[PDB]
Amino acid sequence: TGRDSVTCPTCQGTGRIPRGQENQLVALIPYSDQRLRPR
């Protein structure tokens, strides 16, 4: 049992949404996830 809540009516509680670059650009870049500190 738990509090009352409904699944995301947008992402259907999946965990994936379209970036907002169109509205506001970004200032980041991709990289490689080395073994060191995987978490």
Add this chain to the structure above:
Amino acid sequence: TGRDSVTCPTCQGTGRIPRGQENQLVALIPYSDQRLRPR
């Protein structure tokens, strides 16, 4: 590999959001999920 997408910046891709009754009331009610047709 897959298309580019970011996790829900609201539900953090968890799958739980506050209902919108405050904005718009509802006209539904709870019930029991009998064994017949579980899906």
